[PDB]
Design a protein around this ligand. Structure first.
Ligand SMILES: C=CC[C@@H]1/C=C(\C)C[C@H](C)C[C@H](OC)[C@H]2O[C@@](O)(C(=O)C(=O)N3CCCC[C@H]3C(=O)O[C@H](/C(C)=C/[C@@H]3CC[C@@H](O)[C@H](OC)C3)[C@H](C)[C@@H](O)CC1=O)[C@H](C)C[C@@H]2OC
Length: 191
């Protein structure tokens, strides 16, 4: 308790915790986070109380206390924008794609992960090797048909789907509770 500190790291999708010694540089934490996510350190930016953290700073330096939150930002540099459409869907482009644009009628290929609003993962295509569907076909949940349109190949878009655009009061047997808001990260691979 005296020498070590537990810190919560949030990336807007899930939360995990890191216990390090108060005199250990935050580099150790940042690298553990990056590795766990399969991400390069150069593509991550970490903030605490709105101030940019540097890898050589320690929890002691920053007067951190147990359960304090560090924000991990993976999104493009420049400032994020969260869009709420006419339907109540929300989306956020974490990475802007450089390739072909996804349009209704195409059979598009994506990777995804889905979480509940508490950061519990409910599904993913990555956990073992890509998911293809007819975009705009009414075959997937409404949030997806609406949310994946306009993405570009290379893009990573975070969809926040209110339950009437998801599984509603029914939920999905075994997996999604009644009245659940769903968070997905979708990476567009082909169109
Ligand atoms: C032939 C039948 C099985 C067939 C299953 C697959 C091809 C395998 C595929 C990887 C799905 C996963 O199977 C491991 C599993 O993925 C979830 O975990 C998940 O992450 C999720 O939410 N996804 C998957 C990725 C696209 C978005 C969303 C979805 O839209 O999924 C769609 C979905 C369930 C739509 C319902 C359909 C009924 C409507 O009434 C309802 O309307 C409210 C909406 C899926 C893709 C359907 O088009 C096709 C199927 O169902 C679900 C929580 C439960 C689902 O298992 C079924």
């Amino acid at each position: 308790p005296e020498t070590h500190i537990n810190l919560k790291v949030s990336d807007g999708s899930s939360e995990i915790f890191f216990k390090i010694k108060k005199t250990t540089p935050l580099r150790r934490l940042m690298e553990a986070f990056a590795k766990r996510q399969g991400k390069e350190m150069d593509s991550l930016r970490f903030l605490y109380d709105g101030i940019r953290i540097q890898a050589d700073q320690t929890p002691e330096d920053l007067d951190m206390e147990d359960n304090d939150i560090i924000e991990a930002h993976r999104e493009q540099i420049g400032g994020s924008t969260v869009v709420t459409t006419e339907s109540g869907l929300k989306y956020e482009d974490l990475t802007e794609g450089s390739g072909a644009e996804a349009r209704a009628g195409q059979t598009v290929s994506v990777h995804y992960t889905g979480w509940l609003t508490d950061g519990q993962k409910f599904g993913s295509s990555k956990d073992r090797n890509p998911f293809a569907f007819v975009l705009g076909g009414g075959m997937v949940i409404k949030g997806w048909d609406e949310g994946v349109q306009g993405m570009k190949v290379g893009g990573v878009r975070r969809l926040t789907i209110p339950p009437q655009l998801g599984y509603g009061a029914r939920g999905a047997g075994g997996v999604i509770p009644p009245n659940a808001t769903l968070v997905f990260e979708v990476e567009l691979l082909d169109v």
